[PDB]
Amino acid sequence: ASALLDQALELIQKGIHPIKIANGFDEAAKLAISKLEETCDDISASNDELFRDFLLRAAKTSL
Amino acid sequence: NFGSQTPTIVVLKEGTDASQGKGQIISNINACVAVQEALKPTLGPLGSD
Ligand SMILES: [Mg+2]
């Protein structure tokens, strides 16, 4: 969030209206989510034996 | 006659403001314009908060 505000301060000094800055972030947010959604894959095809492995993978990262 | 002071009676209780003269109704206009100054930039979809 602060990174978005740091890049917005540079655009405000250039004379851009703040609403035009917020309108660009809303359109760019949906383009990033739709791009990452196509790259990921579905792990639900695996059985319960492999499904436990994916739970161990994301556990060690949050710890 | 009850004292050498003999105070002068004031029509209104102490603390009351004054009026008439010139600019009394103008004081009410500048009060509404100053409040309007805050609500002007909030007009329009590109307005601020
Ligand atoms: Mg974490």
From Swiss-Prot, chain A:
It is found in: Cytoplasm. Belongs to the TCP-1 chaperonin family. Heterooligomeric complex of about 850 to 900 kDa that forms two stacked rings, 12 to 16 nm in diameter. Molecular chaperone; assists the folding of proteins upon ATP hydrolysis. Known to play a role, in vitro, in the folding of actin and tubulin. In yeast may play a role in mitotic spindle formation. This is T-complex protein 1 subunit epsilon. The chain holds residues 126 to 188 of 562 of the full protein.
From Swiss-Prot, chain B:
Transmembrane segments: none annotated. It is found in: Cytoplasm. It comes from the Eukaryota. Signal peptide: none annotated. Belongs to the TCP-1 chaperonin family. Heterooligomeric complex of about 850 to 900 kDa that forms two stacked rings, 12 to 16 nm in diameter. Molecular chaperone; assists the folding of proteins upon ATP hydrolysis. Known to play a role, in vitro, in the folding of actin and tubulin. In yeast may play a role in mitotic spindle formation. This is T-complex protein 1 subunit eta. It comes from Saccharomyces cerevisiae (strain ATCC 204508 / S288c). The lineage of its organism: Eukaryota, Fungi, Dikarya, Ascomycota, Saccharomycotina. The gene is CCT7. The chain holds residues 2 to 50 of 550 of the full protein.
